[PDB]
Amino acid sequence: LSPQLEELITKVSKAHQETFPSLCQLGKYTTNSSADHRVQLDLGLWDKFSELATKCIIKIVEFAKRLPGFTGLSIADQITLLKAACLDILMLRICTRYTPEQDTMTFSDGLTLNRTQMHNAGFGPLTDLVFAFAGQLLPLEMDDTETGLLSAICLICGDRMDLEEPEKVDKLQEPLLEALRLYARRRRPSQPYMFPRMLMKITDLRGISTKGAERAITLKMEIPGPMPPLIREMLE
Numbered sequence: 001l002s003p004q005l006e007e008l009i010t011k012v013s014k015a016h017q018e019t020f021p022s023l024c025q026l027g028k029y030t031t032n033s034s035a036d037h038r039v040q041l042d043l044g045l046w047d048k049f050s051e052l053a054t055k056c057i058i059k060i061v062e063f064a065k066r067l068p069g070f071t072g073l074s075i076a077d078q079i080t081l082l083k084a085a086c087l088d089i090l091m092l093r094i095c096t097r098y099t100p101e102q103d104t105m106t107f108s109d110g111l112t113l114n115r116t117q118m119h120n121a122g123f124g125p126l127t128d129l130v131f132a133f134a135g136q137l138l139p140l141e142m143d144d145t146e147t148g149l150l151s152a153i154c155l156i157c158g159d160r161m162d163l164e165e166p167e168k169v170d171k172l173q174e175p176l177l178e179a180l181r182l183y184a185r186r187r188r189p190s191q192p193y194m195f196p197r198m199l200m201k202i203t204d205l206r207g208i209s210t211k212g213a214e215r216a217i218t219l220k221m222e223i224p225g226p227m228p229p230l231i232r233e234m235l236e
């Protein structure tokens with residue numbers, strides 16, 4: 001047993017929770033825009049969606065800086081890691097806000113969109129793949145500590161190209177992986193495949209993020225102006 005490891009778990013858990021409200025903590029509200037038929041694009045929904053995406057990107061940067069050692073990396077390496085992982089973490093985040101009964105996802109201001117509205121906000125032909133990923137996350141029953149650590153593991157990874165100090169990043173990732181296995185096994189000792197299944201979701205996230213970046217390129221053709229600047233930073 002390690003006191004340092006337990007403090008790391010609590011610190012990452014609290015950093016996730018304070019930068020990403022839980023479904024249960026949110027006052028849900030809805031919209032009647034484009035709610036019943038899929039269209040190419042509803043620009044009112046794109047505008048609201050992209051605004052919320054921008055806010056969540058800021059929250060991910062805030063979460064990252066709360067991770068032990070992260071601000072000890074070069075500023076360039078911090079930005080490199082954020083740019084490489086932010087879409088992955090966003091995809092994880094919105095898929096933890098999925099309500100199977102209503103077939104909806106909920107954003108951090110409580111906006112709750114049905115599947116068609118998600119499509120119409122810009123997800124387009126990526127919509128059903130995203131909802132199926134969200135679907136297959138549910139059986140894991142991850143809690144907010146596990147989502148936070150998995151997100152941290154996604155972000156702090158020394159494989160990203162163009163890192164200055166990849167070995168320093170590897171060493172920062174090591175206790176995160178240790179903490180997630182410890183925590184997961186302790187919380188559900190009868191389900192020992194939970195930790196490896198959680199790590200396998202990172203590859204799935206990367207696949208979904210890649211499709212979302214491809215979708216960003218066609219969506220650009222359809223909106224009257226450039227995407228919001230922090231979204232562009234992520235997509236470069």
Ligand SMILES: CCCCCCCCCCCCO[C@H]1O[C@H](CO)[C@@H](O[C@H]2O[C@H](CO)[C@@H](O)[C@H](O)[C@H]2O)[C@H](O)[C@H]1O
Pocket residue numbers: 055057058059061062079082083086230233234
């Ligand atoms: C992946 C793409 C990211 C690559 C790196 C580029 C993004 C770097 C963003 C750092 C932004 C710094 O944030 C700076 O302005 C933000 C908006 O005015 C403020 O953000 C503040 O307001 C937000 C509301 O919009 C809140 O959700 C934040 O919790 C709060 O801290 C910060 O308090 C301030 O420190």
Ligand SMILES: CC1(C)CCC(C)(C)c2cc([C@H](O)C(=O)Nc3ccc(C(=O)O)cc3F)ccc21
Pocket residue numbers: 049052053054056087090091092093094106107108109121122123124126211212213215216219231
């Ligand atoms: C429409 C499409 C496919 C192309 C454009 C970009 C790349 C911006 C993108 C980005 C995401 C991403 O998962 C996201 O931003 N999620 C997200 C997560 C949480 C919150 C919140 O808590 O409020 C808001 C969000 F917006 C999903 C779809 C797309």
